[PDB]
Symmetry: C4
Subunit: 221 residues, 4 copies
Amino acid sequence: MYLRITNIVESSFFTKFIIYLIVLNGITMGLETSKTFMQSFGVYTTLFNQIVITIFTIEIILRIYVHRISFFKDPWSLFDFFVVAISLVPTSSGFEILRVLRVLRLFRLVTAVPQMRKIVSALISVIPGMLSVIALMTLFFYIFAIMATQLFGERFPEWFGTLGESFYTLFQVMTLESWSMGIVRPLMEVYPYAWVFFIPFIFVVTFVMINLVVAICVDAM
Amino acid sequence: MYLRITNIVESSFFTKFIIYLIVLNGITMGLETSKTFMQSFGVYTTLFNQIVITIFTIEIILRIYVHRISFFKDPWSLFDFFVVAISLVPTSSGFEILRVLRVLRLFRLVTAVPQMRKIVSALISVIPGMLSVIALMTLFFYIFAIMATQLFGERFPEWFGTLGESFYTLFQVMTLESWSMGIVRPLMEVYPYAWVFFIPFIFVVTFVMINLVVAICVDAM
Amino acid sequence: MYLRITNIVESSFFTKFIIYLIVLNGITMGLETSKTFMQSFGVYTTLFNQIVITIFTIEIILRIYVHRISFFKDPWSLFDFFVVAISLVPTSSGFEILRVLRVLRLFRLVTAVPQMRKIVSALISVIPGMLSVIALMTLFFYIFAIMATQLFGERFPEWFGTLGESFYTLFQVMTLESWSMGIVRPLMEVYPYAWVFFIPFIFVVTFVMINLVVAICVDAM
Amino acid sequence: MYLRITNIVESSFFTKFIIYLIVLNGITMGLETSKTFMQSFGVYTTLFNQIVITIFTIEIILRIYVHRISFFKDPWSLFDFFVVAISLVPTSSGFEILRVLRVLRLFRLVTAVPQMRKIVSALISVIPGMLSVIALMTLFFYIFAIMATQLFGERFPEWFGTLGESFYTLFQVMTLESWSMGIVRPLMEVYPYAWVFFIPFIFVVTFVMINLVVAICVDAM
């Protein structure tokens, strides 16, 4: 029966059918959002969901047979696998994160549809040639975060009282959001030289970003 | 008479004249702004308005005869058409949106004048080679908008209570405006892990935009 | 005597002497800033100023003789001329703008010193191939500014009650500063669809900027 | 014994060992952050600190013998030298700045590890080809800082009362943070034309930065 199913799976109708449900369930997720719609077509949608997830487990099963080991070595199928598994976990139990994470299946539309795979693929290919810099940066944040925690955490618990607190704040300063009016001016009210810690941080972190950008452009060209 | 008129439309004086009015109506449009001016040269300008729209419906007609089917296949013509059309809709009735959209006619200066067309044409030519990414992103915003609405809309109605409110807020976060001080810090007051939903979102969204820019730059090369 | 002076001006000592005073007066301007220093070396500096400006008028005079018409056709000398003229205007009379504008002479250091001329020259060379786009943009702002003045100036006098008010605000939105929390969220409290006017504005204005950037990189390469 | 030691320093185990401690002291540095941890493994870590700095002064010495004059001519060596030196300065005395600067040792991980050196080296190599612009800009900030101080320092002490306060504020405006809502709008409440000093400043500063980026990108190509 292998080739029998292998012809169903490998078929056109099959994919088109799946890609059909994606956009269908996708639209349903947006309506499941409305408190009103839920009072009307409430159940209609709830059932439509259990249906799709079933149809999708069947599909993922068929695909594994038709691909055996190859499947669990294909990034795209792996995703499809993991994304459907989450959707499988009972509506209740544990936290509703999983209940929310289910919407991640709409990402199935990137997998199932070529071109999308193309862009995503092209974007990710760039990541590798950025890890050296990304690593440099994380070391940088780690070092400055530890320094900030012990330089301002005492009098500024909210923004630097912790290593993670400091990580968050330093990240914020990097995006340049409210860094002066929101964090450094207030800080200088107690530590007049805090600017000696942040301006440099801003320069180094900005310079890198600039370079990083350059890299991608020049390397792609 | 075809060739008779066709020689008027195709004439220099014709274009130069139309371009003359554009800049004139254009200038008079900025005075129509002054509460004071409107108390003096008020009517002068009002009449001058009906005059220009007249002359312009004339011009648009002639052009259609001299071009027939070709006119309604010319992007620039079409624009000129739809922009003068609006300007035609009666001063009253419905809403004043239309009454405001009239100023869109000053865009005719991009049409009537070469060079401007080159830039607009050059800018737009790039759009098509961005649709794969723009689609990817929209999908992304859609998925995260749904998640956010069901994760923070209960306690944060203003920013996430709705799918559309969430779209707006997520766009704001993308432009990085007030994302930390104004949205995420407050959010973490109730949801300590909210940073796990927004930092990644900021990374993905930022990465893409970076790439997209590379593309505009690389492809032009 | 021409060649006599033409040998003084054209000399090395001459330039080095001028470039010397620049950095000298430059440092003096930074001290003239201190309320304290002004209570001590107050006059010392005030005289040192009248001296330099004199020495500089002499210099600019010599240069004109040694160059005649060529002078008033050299951008760099013209600047030097205009910048010294302002410094000439009496300390009193009119407004102190001129009194402040005097500090513009420190820009003499860009003129007098090569390399600086080089960079400035290279930066400005780019401007020309940006005017088409810059023009497009100014038209854009003009049109949207007029629209905003008549769409929100009534209920938001501070930010849109005027054509110029609107120009300023729209510029702010372009730099993306407080555009949502600061201007559009508040605006939507009265005009729920204001986002339909600003998001597009943000996209168009951002797209252009992105392109503009690309241009310079690609054209320079 | 030269070659005897020279074979230890030059050995793999030597480097791997040093790199081992870096990551160890590194990890222990993030725990030294926890108020709690310090109440438990408090001393454990404290002693482990004196141990590492010891081992490191040893390592730095050996290296100097095996390299002599070459050591104090190696940027990376020098860094390792000056970073361990600080870490040597007694826990007490003077200020704890030094006590905090100790964490800078984790930067040794950039030194001791190749690849990291490549990036840092690659990033820095670009700096030199930016000094002409960086000089131009600094001149610019200096001139505008002086002007601003004498134009708004009287009524706006916090942001412009001083040459240095002005430097800080102008830098903030350059990063575009809160420049309108937080600085210029308030300013215009007393000085209606302040927009004539800041928009141009924003244009010049933005233009340059754009170019500077082009340079990093173009030159790498």
